[PDB]
Structures are given as structure tokens and as C-alpha cells.
Amino acid sequence: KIYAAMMIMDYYKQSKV
Amino acid sequence: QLTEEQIAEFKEAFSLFDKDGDGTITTKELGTVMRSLGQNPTEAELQDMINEVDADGNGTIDFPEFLTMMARKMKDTDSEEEIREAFRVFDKDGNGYISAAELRHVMTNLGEKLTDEEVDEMIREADIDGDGQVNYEEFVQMMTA
Ligand SMILES: [Ca+2]
Ligand SMILES: [Ca+2]
Ligand SMILES: [Ca+2]
Ligand SMILES: [Ca+2]
Secondary structure, eight states: OHHHHHHHHHHHHHHHO | OOOHHHHHHHHHHHHHHOTTOSSEEOHHHHHHHHHHTTOOOOHHHHHHHHHHHOSSOSSSEEHHHHHHHHHHHHHOSOOHHHHHHHHHHHOTTOSSOBOHHHHHHHHHHHTOOOOHHHHHHHHHHHOSSSSSSBOHHHHHHHHHO
16 A cells, blocks of 8 residues: 555656646 | 765655654654555554554654665566555546646645646657556556666
8 A cells, every 4th residue: 555655756846846 | 876966855755754854754654654655544444554664663764765675666666556556646636637726736735836838848749659647567667767
């Protein structure tokens, strides 16, 4: 669950950028 | 290996967990993130998640620890099972496909209001087969790129 969240947050920020 | 732009992007991701900006992710900050992803982990579950990344056992995650995990796991090829959990975070109705509305829902919950045009662009970028939606194989590529 935590690593899934980490991958998602990475995708999220790079989607913003 | 791990590039300097990957380092920068992993740090940006870390800082989104580390919301008070003190350099360490606590169970409390981890909770905030998990709830915005539609989950509700208990304190024990939050502490056990910390155990996964916290290498020196002090009860929090610093950036070098966060980076160690991100860098190591990206070299792994056995994270299908975790990506499947990540998929289910987006696929709220469980139909096997992430829709624009499902994508925008998760994005806005993390702190990003997108237009209907911007969500469509993201789906369009990830959508390989052309059903205007994201299945698992396409989702892997969007978590793996
Ligand atoms: Ca903190
Ligand atoms: Ca630590
Ligand atoms: Ca769905
Ligand atoms: Ca598709």
C-alpha cells in the first residue's frame, strides 16, 4: 500500500509539472 | 541507474508526503495521503507501512530512505502485485478500466483541479488501445515510464 502510494504521488506531481 | 532528474522528481514526491516540510514523513502525514487515496489505515497499519521504508527504525521516513526504496524498486521487475493495488485506487467502480472521471477524482483529491480537457489529455497519453480508458497494462506503463 505505501509503495503504491509513492508511485501514485510520483505520477501525480509529474502530471502537474 | 538512477538519473539526476529522477532524483529531483522523487524528492518532489517525497515533499508531497512531508507536508510540514521538516524532512521526515510521520505516520500522521502518511495517514493524510492514504485517506486522500480513499483508504483508512489504522495506526498499526500506518506504522507497519513505515517499517517498509524506514531503514534505521526510528519511526519516520527521511528522503534518503524514500529514495533508496524508489531507486531499488524501479530496478525490480516483481512489483506487478503492488501496481495492481495502485490500479484499484483509481478504478473505483472496479470495472477494470480507469475512466477520465476516475482519474480526475484521484487527481483532485491529491490537490490538483484539472479541466475536462486536461484529464482527457492524460487519458489520451496513457490510452494505448483506444477505448478512451486505462486498463492494467496501460496503467503499468503510466506508473513505470
Ligand atoms: Ca514531516
Ligand atoms: Ca528513518
Ligand atoms: Ca472504472
Ligand atoms: Ca485503453
